[PDB]
Scaffold this active site. Structure first.
Site, short mmCIF file in Angstrom:
data_model
loop_
_atom_site.label_atom_id
_atom_site.label_comp_id
_atom_site.label_asym_id
_atom_site.label_seq_id
_atom_site.Cartn_x
_atom_site.Cartn_y
_atom_site.Cartn_z
N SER A 150 10.74 11.57 28.06
CA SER A 150 11.80 11.56 27.03
C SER A 150 11.46 10.61 25.91
CB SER A 150 13.14 11.13 27.66
OG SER A 150 14.11 10.90 26.64
N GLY A 151 11.56 11.08 24.66
CA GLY A 151 11.26 10.22 23.53
C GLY A 151 9.78 10.16 23.12
N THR A 155 9.59 17.35 20.75
CA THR A 155 10.39 18.16 19.82
C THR A 155 9.86 18.08 18.42
OG1 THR A 155 12.32 18.33 21.11
CG2 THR A 155 12.73 18.40 18.77
N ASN A 197 16.30 8.18 23.77
CA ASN A 197 16.01 9.00 22.61
C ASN A 197 17.30 9.29 21.87
OD1 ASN A 197 15.09 10.83 20.70
ND2 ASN A 197 14.17 12.28 22.18
N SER A 200 17.67 13.18 21.80
CA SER A 200 17.20 13.74 23.06
C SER A 200 17.54 15.22 23.22
CB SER A 200 17.79 12.95 24.23
OG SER A 200 17.24 13.39 25.46
N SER A 201 16.55 16.05 23.60
CA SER A 201 16.90 17.45 23.87
C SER A 201 17.57 17.54 25.22
CB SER A 201 15.65 18.32 23.97
OG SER A 201 14.88 18.21 22.80
N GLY A 440 12.15 15.97 28.62
CA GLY A 440 11.08 15.23 29.26
C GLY A 440 11.51 14.31 30.41
N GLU A 442 12.68 11.47 32.66
CA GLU A 442 13.55 10.38 32.26
C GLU A 442 14.18 9.73 33.50
OE1 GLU A 442 16.64 12.26 29.77
OE2 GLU A 442 17.94 12.56 31.51
N1 ADP Z 1 5.07 12.53 14.66
C1 ADP Z 1 6.22 11.86 14.43
N2 ADP Z 1 6.53 11.37 13.20
C2 ADP Z 1 7.66 10.67 12.95
N3 ADP Z 1 8.59 10.41 13.89
C3 ADP Z 1 8.41 10.87 15.16
C4 ADP Z 1 7.20 11.63 15.52
N4 ADP Z 1 7.30 11.94 16.84
C5 ADP Z 1 8.49 11.43 17.28
N5 ADP Z 1 9.14 10.79 16.26
C6 ADP Z 1 10.41 10.02 16.34
O1 ADP Z 1 10.66 9.75 17.72
C7 ADP Z 1 11.90 10.36 18.08
C8 ADP Z 1 11.82 11.06 19.43
O2 ADP Z 1 10.93 12.18 19.38
P1 ADP Z 1 11.31 13.60 20.04
O3 ADP Z 1 10.28 14.60 19.67
O4 ADP Z 1 12.79 13.82 19.79
O5 ADP Z 1 11.11 13.14 21.59
P2 ADP Z 1 11.07 14.14 22.84
O6 ADP Z 1 9.65 14.08 23.37
O7 ADP Z 1 12.10 13.57 23.78
O8 ADP Z 1 11.32 15.44 22.21
C9 ADP Z 1 12.23 11.33 16.93
O9 ADP Z 1 13.64 11.44 16.76
C10 ADP Z 1 11.62 10.67 15.72
O10 ADP Z 1 12.45 9.58 15.30
O1 VO4 Z 2 14.38 12.76 25.01
V1 VO4 Z 2 13.51 14.43 25.17
O2 VO4 Z 2 12.14 14.69 26.42
O3 VO4 Z 2 14.16 15.73 24.11
O4 VO4 Z 2 14.79 15.20 26.43
MG MG Z 3 13.06 16.78 22.62
#
Ligand code: ADP
Ligand code: VO4
Ligand code: MG
Length: 754
Positions: A150-151, A155, A197, A200-201, A440, A442
């Site tokens: 997670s985080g 996404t 996060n 978070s999805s 992810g 968590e």
């Molecule tokens: N390549 C990136 N560029 C800028 N910010 C990012 C990037 N990847 C992640 N983030 C930041 O980290 C946060 C969490 O990423 P996200 O993809 O939502 O996590 P998860 O793996 O849970 O989907 C995002 O809301 C954004 O603030």
């Molecule tokens: O914080 V993520 O792996 O979207 O659920």
């Molecule tokens: Mg996500």
């Protein structure tokens, strides 16, 4: 001396010199801290790259391939805002936690189009383009699997892939507006602030972009999995409900606020156990009206995030809806149901002579019934009784209310996903490229059935990576007689079996409990420990490494040793959370709404766990049928901050994700390959008589030489020819089927024979 890598508790490794060796251990002197020493085991110390300032784009190009040099190389790149690094044709992505300029620009997109791996810097765009090229050439649908806890960035990287493929290979602004601009809508309804996060999805998705025979985008399709339900009614104090509630409260016009009877989030049971603050900055806080702000927001100020902003996201979401083609009636229909659920939650009950609605809940009842198109008495009755009528205790009425809330919102989400799919429909397609974005791995101070299901799904995904990249890859080498050194690794199938096995797996034992005359969480939990005493993957809570978990009783929780780490689950409410069935009394009520939109949302025991297992296995079938590419997202720290590389935390991810094992395998492995027969035959057509007389194996060797390979770059197997890491560009030229290209090389080699 010559600097080596030796353990460091927070950095993972540190630089030092070996200053003694003994029969039992080594003695290391940390660089610059001369005179000081520490002991290390021989097997824990690694050779280091001679130049500690340089980096390589592909870790396979390191002089020494090991977990310590991998860690350092990624660290150096990360310090220079290079978040992407290869291991052969696998991408590692470290979350930067800030927006790095220009790296996702339309100009950068164009620069990746048609470029072989390794000819451009590591990038999510290169993974997407390689999936596109394999689809187009191999005539095989493709999956891009984006993994991580997670985080970690799954996404955001999923979205980069979708933007890249649609902007590159879809014609028009429309199909782009539709596939990409659909995202703010899904996130509004399916994402929420957790402690790991802010965005978070809370559902999983597989997004397929479909292509015609000419490899141009014809449409999309989104499959969604296991929206988190408990969140709809209650959150912990640092977490929030789904974003839509906050976006609507902060962003709706006065006219809409009045019509939906909204107010600040502290006013709603379904929001007010959680954090009631908005994401906002100095400017956007000015755009939120004072009557939307909770007392907590007034005292503490806004939540801060570089991406999320409830007011700005409301506007953006509204713009998104317009762009993909939702009309204003559809928008308001969405909002009305969101509000109906909120007012539903404000209904309170009190013990009767059974139970009644508290007098103070009359309004909530009126607002709810109105918004959901229900008759107030029907609603009152359905919440306070069941079926011959039977009166409910307050606790039961609370549950009935919440169950209705959960089913309504969940069907609303299903409609949203469906409506999105209706924005980019297609009648037929030749192939697709699908991107997997799950919730992810968590864990928290308290872990429940939601975490259990999420982590189970992550376990299953990691097993797919193991199956494809570590097991099948090596079986291929073996079958072809390549003699590549076997790499052994810890497999997690036993963890999956613990959860999944027929009859004795955790999910089946839970189902059994649900079907008992008197279902008990403690009874289910005991049965699990009983049936699995001395299972490597299962422990009682008091064995936890964390004090907070040790106070949990044996029949009140269990520890699962996941591939990514031990997680202790409290099993209270596992039985309740495992049942997806809704009472027909509640179902009929909603099904017979006067409102057409409400009816259309809806077209004893149903196992949530086994429904999920079934959907995931169908997903896995689909993944198995495709060529698969992998992006391993890595979370750099626990603080959501930029330029804060926690070496030990990152090393742990590199290990459990299997990247250390893959790096090991790539020391002698061959990530590219093709059928010899097919390869030869492709060129054979163009060969002058003298060249056609040449031995086919000899021709191939001459071809490879001509296209820039050395003998150590390739190796002939039984039926396939294999190529080393770092040689994708030459492989691609070798495999290029363009008649003009074929002819030129045939000419060149036939010339050597004059
Ligand atoms: N390549 C990136 N560029 C800028 N910010 C990012 C990037 N990847 C992640 N983030 C930041 O980290 C946060 C969490 O990423 P996200 O993809 O939502 O996590 P998860 O793996 O849970 O989907 C995002 O809301 C954004 O603030
Ligand atoms: O914080 V993520 O792996 O979207 O659920
Ligand atoms: Mg996500």
């Amino acid at each position: 001396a010559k600097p080596v890598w030796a353990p460091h508790p927070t950095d993972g490794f540190q630089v030092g010199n070996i200053v003694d060796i003994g029969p039992d251990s080594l003695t290391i002197e940390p660089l610059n801290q001369k005179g000081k020493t520490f002991l290390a085991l021989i097997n824990q110390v690694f050779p280091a790259e001679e130049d500690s300032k340089k980096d390589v784009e592909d870790n396979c190009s390191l002089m020494y391939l090991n977990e310590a040099t991998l860690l350092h190389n990624i660290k150096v790149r990360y310090s220079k805002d290079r978040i992407y690094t290869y291991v052969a044709n696998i991408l590692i992505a470290v979350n930067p936690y800030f927006d790095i300029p220009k790296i996702y620009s339309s100009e950068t997109i164009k620069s990746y189009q048609g470029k072989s791996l390794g000819t451009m810097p590591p990038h999510v765009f290169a993974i997407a383009d390689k999936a596109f090229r394999d689809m187009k050439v191999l005539k095989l649908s493709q999956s891009i699997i984006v993994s991580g806890e997670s985080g970690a960035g799954k996404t955001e990287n999923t979205k980069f892939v979708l933007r890249y493929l649609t902007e590159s290979y879809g014609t028009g602004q429309d199909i782009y507006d539709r596939i990409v601009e659909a995202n703010p809508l899904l996130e509004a309804f399916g994402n929420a602030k957790t402690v790991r996060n802010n965005n978070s999805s809370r559902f999983g998705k597989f997004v397929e972009i479909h292509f015609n025979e000419k490899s141009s985008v014809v449409g999309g399709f989104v499959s969604h999995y296991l929206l988190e339900k408990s969140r709809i009614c209650v959150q912990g104090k640092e977490e929030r409900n789904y974003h839509i509630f906050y976006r609507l409260c902060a962003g709706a016009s006065e006219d809409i606020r009045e019509r939906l009877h909204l107010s600040s989030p502290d006013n709603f049971r379904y929001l007010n156990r959680g954090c009631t603050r908005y994401f906002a900055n100095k400017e956007t806080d000015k755009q939120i009206l004072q009557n939307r702000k909770s007392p907590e927001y007034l005292k503490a100020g806004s939540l801060k995030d570089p991406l999320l902003d409830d007011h700005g996201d409301f506007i953006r979401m509204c713009t998104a809806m317009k762009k993909i083609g939702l009309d204003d009636e559809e928008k308001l229909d969405l909002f009305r149901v969101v509000a109906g659920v909120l007012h539903l939650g404000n209904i309170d009950f009190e013990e009767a002579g059974g139970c009644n609605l508290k007098n103070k809940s009359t309004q909530a009842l009126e607002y709810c019934a109105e918004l959901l198109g229900l008759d107030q008495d029907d609603l009152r009755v359905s919440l306070t009784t069941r079926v011959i009528k039977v009166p409910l205790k307050v606790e039961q009425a609370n549950n009935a209310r919440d169950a209705l809330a959960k089913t309504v919102y969940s069907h609303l989400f299903d409609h949203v996903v469906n409506r999105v799919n209706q924005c980019f429909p297609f009648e037929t397609s030749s192939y697709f490229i699908g991107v997997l974005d799950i919730a992810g791995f968590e864990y928290f101070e308290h872990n429940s059935f939601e975490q259990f299901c999420i982590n189970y799904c992550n376990e299953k995904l990691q097993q797919f990576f193991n199956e494809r990249i570590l097991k099948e890859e090596q079986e291929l080498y073996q079958k072809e007689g390549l003699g590549v050194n076997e790499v052994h690794y810890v497999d997690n199938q036993d963890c999956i079996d613990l959860i999944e096995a027929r009859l004795v797996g955790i999910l089946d034992i839970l189902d059994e409990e649900n079907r008992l005359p008197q279902p008990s969480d403690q009874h289910f939990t005991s049965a699990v420990h009983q049936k699995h005493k001395d299972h490597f993957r299962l422990s009682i809570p008091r064995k936890s490494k964390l004090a907070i978990h040790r106070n949990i009783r044996d029949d009140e929780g269990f520890i699962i040793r996941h591939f990514a780490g031990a997680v202790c689950y409290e099993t209270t409410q596992f039985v309740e959370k495992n049942n997806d069935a809704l009472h027909m009394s509640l179902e009929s009520l909603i099904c017979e709404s006067r409102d057409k939109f409400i009816r259309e949302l809806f077209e004893s025991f149903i196992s949530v766990g086994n429904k999920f297992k079934t959907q995931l296995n169908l997903l896995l079938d689909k993944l198995r049928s495709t060529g698969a590419s992998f992006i391993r997202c890595i979370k750099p720290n626990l603080k959501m901050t930029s330029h804060h590389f926690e070496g030990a935390q990152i090393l742990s991810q590199l290990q459990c994700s299997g990247m250390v094992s893959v790096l090991d395998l790539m020391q002698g492995g061959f990530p590219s390959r093709a059928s010899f027969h097919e390869l030869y035959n492709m060129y054979k057509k163009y060969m002058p008589d003298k060249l056609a007389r040449l031995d086919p194996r000899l021709f191939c060797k001459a071809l490879f030489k001509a296209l820039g390979l050395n003998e150590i770059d390739y190796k002939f197997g039984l039926t396939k020819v294999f190529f080393r890491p770092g040689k994708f560009a030459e492989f691609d030229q070798i495999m290029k089927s363009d008649p003009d290209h074929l002819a030129e090389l045939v000419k060149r080699v036939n010339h050597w024979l004059i």
